[PDB]
Design a protein around this nucleic acid. Structure first.
Ligand SMILES: [Mg+2]
Ligand SMILES: [Mg+2]
Ligand SMILES: [Mg+2]
Ligand SMILES: [Mg+2]
Ligand SMILES: [Mg+2]
Ligand SMILES: [Mg+2]
Ligand SMILES: [Mg+2]
Ligand SMILES: [Mg+2]
Ligand SMILES: [Mg+2]
Ligand SMILES: [Mg+2]
Ligand SMILES: [Mg+2]
Ligand SMILES: [Mg+2]
Ligand SMILES: [Mg+2]
Ligand SMILES: [Mg+2]
Ligand SMILES: [Mg+2]
Ligand SMILES: [Mg+2]
Ligand SMILES: [Mg+2]
Ligand SMILES: [Mg+2]
Ligand SMILES: [Mg+2]
Ligand SMILES: [Mg+2]
Ligand SMILES: [Mg+2]
Ligand SMILES: [Mg+2]
Ligand SMILES: [Mg+2]
Lengths: 123, 205, 129, 155, 82, 80
RNA sequence: UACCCGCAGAAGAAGCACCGGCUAACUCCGUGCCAGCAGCCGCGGUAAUACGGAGGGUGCAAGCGUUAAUCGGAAUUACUGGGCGUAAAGCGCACGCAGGCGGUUUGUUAAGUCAGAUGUGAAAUCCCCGGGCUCAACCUGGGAACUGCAUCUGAUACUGG
RNA sequence: UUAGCUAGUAGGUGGGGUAACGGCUCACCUAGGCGACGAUCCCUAGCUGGUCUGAGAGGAUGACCAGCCACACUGGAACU
């Protein structure tokens, strides 16, 4: 409180701790698929959510979501990951970029295609 | 860069005539003017405070044929300028060449006037100006160039114009197809069911 | 201990005023007497006196209007723990000029208004409205 | 000619044997656009009964503020429970730049040009309470002159 | 040595020169000692286009500053204009 | 044109030198409190006439040693 | 090359995200705690405006979304501008060096503080009024600003000696 | 969650030395010099005009333009 006190010990803003450290302030990172599996989510939800463990080009190894309905990914699949947690999946803090590198687009999508790596259908 | 779709939809959504057609017709004989477009047009919007601000800004934009980026820049300039920002916004819009071309009656619509401009049919001070957003100044003389003078669009455009209220700040010679931007319009010259302060509110938050 | 007698002065005023007291009294000092002078001259108190020679007791006659205290706020600005000085072109004004700031200059204690008009800056002793 | 503005509607709930009883609250302000402002707060099982009870309260319980050509005399601070409030007389042309709760109060009041900001809890019922009192305690170049016993230039 | 010359500002295809006194070794658009005129080769010539503080130019020459071929021309041109 | 400093003698031990401390008040850049700051200067005292505690007037001159760029002008007050 | 004239024909030139609340935009069909969505709350077990398709609509537009990143809102490190009985926060208590602060009068000093003058504070940038490219971006004239530093000369109420 | 640091060290004399003042260097002499107003040690980093943000005070930052510095495969050296 005292002026004297601040003069001895200045106000010191807290440094923000990141939510996607594996990215190291990069917009995406590349990595190899270590395990490709499903996992169940947290109260109150229930499903078999597709996730993968991925060793990134910078050594970090993280779990990443594989959004969309259907995917053709396996071990040694080279994928691109981006920031973005999965809320009912604790530990999951990244998303896989559908339709980049070895990851295919979602099949048969018509709405929100660009978020699922899907070309515009000839029509 | 231009809105090219159906036009009366825009009027219908904003709840008013936006003069996007010549005016040869009662607008209610061309569309269901008092009902929004779509399956749920009859539905009433219990409309939020943000909503009324948005729609008012859309209304003005749709009147003048301006997309968001340019219109935002228009707000920025109105703000920077001295005097009331809301009124400055309307001065800037009303000083556009496509607009002035419309007000002198050379085009049936601002869309038509804009085409006149783009297609090198309009001169300012005997000099060809072909960009729609060219800011016109007091004492400027805008004219249909000689070769564009026999276009039947222009004659019809001047006829309709003669049937609209006649703008004070423009002196138009229909014979010569030239006209003079005498002065910037005051606020009082422009329609009173435009709520600029809402647009000003939308862009300050 | 009693390390700021001016805050003490401000406060004795403020509290007796809040307590609808007719007058307040405190150990005197030239600097208090210089401030009391400004208050009176600007009509925030009736009048004042100092009594005694060896242990001078200063007395301020407070002022009331609509069964209200004339002094609405009275606050210490500069203080022993943080001296505040301003230049002529930096002189604060209270309530957009409706109140006053008491300023101490090379030419003695006066209001922000006075010091402003006389091309001076000084230590900002207090605000009063 | 009185101007009235609905600031917030809210659902509260009361618990009994049978379960929860839901009701509504309404917070409003009426003003004369020329220096008079009242706020009201009503409760009712249905929203219309609540928005209506409040106007009724807002019409009486109304106070005067010493405006100055559509703007304030001097900067002012207001406080009530969680809400610290601050207002400034802006130059002409600016209009009212302020939060929703305050804007409604200032608009109906007739304060044409002001800079405002709410600190701490923006709880609408206490924000408006704090603004009204701020404007109300706001004194006038004439009353300070009266107070100080002098009609100098400052009058 | 010290030289009086044109530092080319303006934009692509629209040259605009700032006449400057400087140590000849510094880059053309780099460190200079004093600015002393400008030269618009693209001026409409309806109004101005070439302005030189001839008093300070001469002062610097008097102290041995050299002068560009192009500034030496401007000075003869401006001396002719008035 | 006689630029000068005033300070007091904190050390007089060295042969023909002295350490002088110049103290001043300074507004704190962030928190506004006025803080004491001190500047110690190695100064030349040919003849060693300056005693510790003395108050002395000094001036800036050319380098006299790795750390001396100041010399004594005169003593002001002494032996408090 | 800029720019100007001529020829052909609407001819070669529209996509992206969103529509449960925050937040502008709603319906049907499919699915049925699955498949899936999800910035935050939170959606999904038979009427789902929240999943996926469709029709309709909203917002942007040669871009539109997602991710990354700084500041903002955050008065959420609070100098301006916060707190510590019960919410995070009074050291279990006392003595006390350094340090911070210090009652009242006179004289003195003139470091702090205040005033003025002078020099400096590169240009560009920012801002103001103009000028030039068809407009704008852009380029450019002049100004104002650089809220700072330093020297000298004063003022002496307050702080320091 | 670094409290003590320092023998060319701090100063003096004299010789040498540089374009020039100087422990720059050498001999001799004195025993100093720095440090809680943060020395020493450890981590990080080119500095500025300015840039972005913010009503402001601040916060963050130092591509592009301009000024200063430093470097030229790594460590060292001088010659012209
Ligand atoms: Mg564009
Ligand atoms: Mg809060
Ligand atoms: Mg809605
Ligand atoms: Mg979605
Ligand atoms: Mg269904
Ligand atoms: Mg972000
Ligand atoms: Mg902050
Ligand atoms: Mg708190
Ligand atoms: Mg108790
Ligand atoms: Mg506790
Ligand atoms: Mg205790
Ligand atoms: Mg004297
Ligand atoms: Mg121009
Ligand atoms: Mg310029
Ligand atoms: Mg200039
Ligand atoms: Mg500059
Ligand atoms: Mg004294
Ligand atoms: Mg020697
Ligand atoms: Mg480095
Ligand atoms: Mg380069
Ligand atoms: Mg490059
Ligand atoms: Mg550079
Ligand atoms: Mg080397």
């Amino acid at each position: 409180a005292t002026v004297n006190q601040l003069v001895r010990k200045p106000r010191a803003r807290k440094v923000a701790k990141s939510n996607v450290p594996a990215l190291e302030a990069c917009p995406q990172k590349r990595g190899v698929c270590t395990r490709v599996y499903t996992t169940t989510p947290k109260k109150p939800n229930s499903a078999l959510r597709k996730v993968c463990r991925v060793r990134l080009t910078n050594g970090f190894e993280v779990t990443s979501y594989i959004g969309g309905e259907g995917h053709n990914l396996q071990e040694h699949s080279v994928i691109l990951i981006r920031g973005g947690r999965v809320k009912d999946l604790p530990g999951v803090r990244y998303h896989t970029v559908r339709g980049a590198l070895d990851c295919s687009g979602v099949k048969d999508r018509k709405q929100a295609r660009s978020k699922y790596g899907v070309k515009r259908p000839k029509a | 860069a231009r809105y090219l779709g159906p036009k009366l939809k825009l009027s219908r959504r904003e709840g008013t005539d936006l003069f996007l057609k010549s005016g040869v017709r009662a607008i209610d004989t061309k569309c269901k003017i008092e009902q929004a477009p779509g399956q749920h047009g009859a539905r009433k919007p219990r409309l939020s405070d943000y909503g009324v601000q948005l729609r008012e800004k859309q209304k003005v934009r749709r009147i003048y044929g301006v997309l968001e980026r340019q219109f935002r820049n228009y707000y920025k300039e109105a703000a920077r300028l001295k005097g009331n920002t809301g009124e400055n916004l309307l001065a800037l819009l009303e000083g556009r060449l496509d607009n002035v071309v419309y007000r002198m009656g050379f085009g049936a619509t601002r869309a038509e006037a804009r085409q006149l401009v783009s297609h090198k049919a309009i001169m300012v001070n005997g000099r060809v100006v072909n960009i729609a957003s060219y800011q016109v100044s007091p004492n400027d003389v805008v004219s249909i160039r000689e070769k564009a003078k026999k276009q039947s669009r222009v004659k019809a455009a001047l006829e309709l114009a003669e049937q609209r209220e006649k703008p004070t700040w423009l002196e138009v010679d229909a014979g010569k197809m030239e006209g003079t931007f005498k002065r910037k319009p005051e606020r009082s010259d422009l329609s009173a069911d435009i709520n600029e302060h809402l647009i000003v509110e939308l862009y300050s938050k | 201990s009693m390390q700021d007698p001016i805050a003490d002065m401000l406060t004795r005023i403020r509290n007796g005023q809040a307590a609808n007291k007719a007058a307040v009294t405190m150990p005197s000092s030239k600097l208090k007497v210089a401030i009391a002078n400004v208050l009176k001259e600007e009509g925030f108190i009736e009048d004042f006196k100092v009594e005694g020679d060896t242990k001078p007791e200063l007395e301020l006659t407070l002022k009331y209007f609509q069964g209200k205290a004339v002094v609405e706020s009275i606050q210490r600005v500069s203080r022993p723990g943080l001296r505040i000085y301003k230049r002529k072109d930096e002189l604060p004004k209270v309530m957009a000029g409706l109140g006053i700031a008491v300023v101490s200059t090379s030419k003695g204690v006066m209001t922000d208004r006075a010091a402003r008009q006389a091309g001076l800056g000084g230590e900002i002793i207090c605000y009063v409205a | 000619e009185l101007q009235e503005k609905l600031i917030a509607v809210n659902r509260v709930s009361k618990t009994v044997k049978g379960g929860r009883i839901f009701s509504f609250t309404a917070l409003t302000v009426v003003g004369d656009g020329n220096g008079r402002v009242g706020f009201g707060y009503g409760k009712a099982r249905e929203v219309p009964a609540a928005i209506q009870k409040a106007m009724e309260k807002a019409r009486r319980n109304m106070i005067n503020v010493a405006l100055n050509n559509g703007t304030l005399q001097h900067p002012v601070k207001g406080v009530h429970t969680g809400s610290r409030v601050f207002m400034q007389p802006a130059s002409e042309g600016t209009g009212i730049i302020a939060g929703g709760a305050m804007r409604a109060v200032l608009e109906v009041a007739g304060v044409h040009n002001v800079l405002a900001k709410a600190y701490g809890s923006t709880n609408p019922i206490n924000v408006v309470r704090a603004t009204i009192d701020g404007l109300e305690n706001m004194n006038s170049p004439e009353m300070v002159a009266a107070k100080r016993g002098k009609s100098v230039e400052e009058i | 040595m010290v030289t009086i010359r044109l530092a080319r500002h303006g934009a692509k295809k629209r040259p605009f020169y700032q006449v400057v006194v400087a140590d000849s070794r510094n880059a053309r658009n780099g460190r200079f000692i004093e600015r002393v005129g400008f030269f618009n080769p693209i001026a409409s010539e309806k109004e101005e286009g070439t302005r030189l503080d001839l008093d300070r130019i001469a002062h610097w020459v008097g102290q041995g500053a050299t002068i560009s071929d192009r500034v030496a021309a401007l000075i003869k041109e401006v001396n002719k204009a008035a | 044109k006689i630029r000068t400093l005033q300070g007091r003698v904190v050390s007089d031990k060295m042969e023909k030198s002295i350490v002088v401390a110049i103290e001043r008040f300074v507004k704190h850049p962030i928190y506004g409190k006025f803080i004491k700051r001190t500047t110690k200067l190695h100064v030349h005292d040919e003849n060693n006439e300056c005693g510790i505690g003395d108050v002395v007037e000094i001036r800036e001159c050319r380098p006299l040693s790795k750390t001396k760029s100041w010399t004594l002008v005169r003593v002001v007050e002494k032996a408090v």
